[PDB]
Structure 1
């Protein structure tokens, strides 16, 4: 019997958002005590494993069900988030093991948020499909319109991926398996300066259909670092 993921990994600065009927959020403290369920468990290879059904609960700020970590700079206050200035880096390794009928899940994000804690658009969405990961960077801070697409081909269902998502002074650097692509989001829209951000990682299942089944994503490592210095890449 393996330890729960919040024992194996440092989840002191994450909460877990679930696809149960109530769209429950497990606090960092409860992750640390060893929370585990059908949605979130340690597999035999040790991976922190996220399962979400397409029939799951959905929240006001999410189009689809999720079993997904949400970064908590302050483990007891979701209104504490980071800015466009400085260097903000998430590194992970993982794989997607099962897809919903739509064939598409989101496995990491940077999400915008207002100072008051209210929703703002997603900034980066790491969209996995069998054969390609697309690290979508939103153009407008309004949340209207489309994404800058960044295609990483050759990543199959079951393949190990290594990912880094970095913001350095309003520039997004998106990296899959050593291939780095940049989008100057602040340069494109100064409105991004008026938002704050948080990282996410897990399984945000891009299928809400009755017959869509479920998805499984795994992480083998997950780390976040923040500094108001200027580390480009």
Structure 2
């Protein structure tokens, strides 16, 4: 192929720029209009081809336009395991694997001279409509159980923990029941402009993140078991973790594969 190996039939994209038809909401493309990204006057600014090395660039920066739970701007893919649908999602028991080949093509520094941080892969929980309505929530949001960062020359992983292990079901369904773990870093330093591979392997009660098919960070304790009540979708691209004026990142993806 002349372009990156990304199966567009299983992703939507949200970008930093406002949707003119939904003031205050970021522009997005799903299937099949997402295939037109190179020619879309809005999206092609933020998701575009590098034909020289067959990558797709995800370019993001603080735009002031974000979605409801989001807080930072993004140029990022959201997995649709069923082409055309947001509502079909997977449990950890069902499982899933995502493989991507990435490079951090460019990124800003913060005023203290340290690089800005960027989230390049996630697993995001999502409530079913039945769960949402059980607890009376305004939308289907649920915590990002996995966030994978590029952070000052390392790949860093953050996961969620259940704060109270005897919390009842309806409490467990709320984001307030889930806190952050302490974070874990891969040993291998990843410089800018360096291809690396990420693989995320999810199965019942178990989440594994692999860098360059060498080191694995494995999550398999009680919190992964408790997390089984959620459905999930993968995310990949550039969820940019700064609002400092003038900051940005560009994340290249050469290959992206999801299986269930």
Candidates 120, 124, 128, aligned match of 1:115: 128
1:34: how far off?
4.5
Which of 37, 47, 57 is equivalent to 1:40? 47
Q: CA deviation at 1:191?
A: 3.6
How many Å apart are 1:56 and its aligned residue?
4.4
Residues 25-174 of structure 1: matches in 2 within 5 Å? 25-36=28-39, 37-43=44-50, 44-102=52-110, 103-116=116-129, 118-140=140-162, 142-143=174-175, 144-152=178-186, 153-174=188-209
State the 1:148 CA deviation: 4.5
Deviations 1:167-204 (A, max 9, x none): 1102110111121110125x226441221100000000
Query: CA–CA distance in 1 between the matches of 2:255 and 2:64?
Result: 26
Aligned equivalents of 2:37, 2:70: Cα separation in 1: 26
The separation in 2 between residues aligned to 1:139 and 1:60, in whole angstroms, is 23
Structure 2: runs of 5+ lacking an equivalent? 20-25, 111-115, 130-138, 163-171
Which structure has the highest helix share of the two? Answer: 2
Q: TM-score, normalised by structure 2?
A: 0.78
Higher strand share: 1
Q: Any runs of at least 4 consecutive aligned residues in structure 1 with deviations exceeding 3 A, and if so which?
A: 2-5, 33-36, 141-144
| 1:181 counterpart residue number | 217
Aligned residues: 221
Separation in 2, partners of 1:208, 1:51: 14
What are the ranges of 5 or more consecutive residues in structure 1 without an aligned counterpart? 227-233
- Per-residue deviation, residues 87-138 of structure 1 (Å, max 9, x unmatched): 3100010111222444100001110000126110001101112310112121
Closer, same or farther: CA 123–147 of 1 in aligned 2, 3 Å: same
> What secondary structure, in the 3-state scheme, does the structure 2 residue paired with 1:127 have?
strand
Partner of 1:198: 233
TM-score (norm 1): 0.87
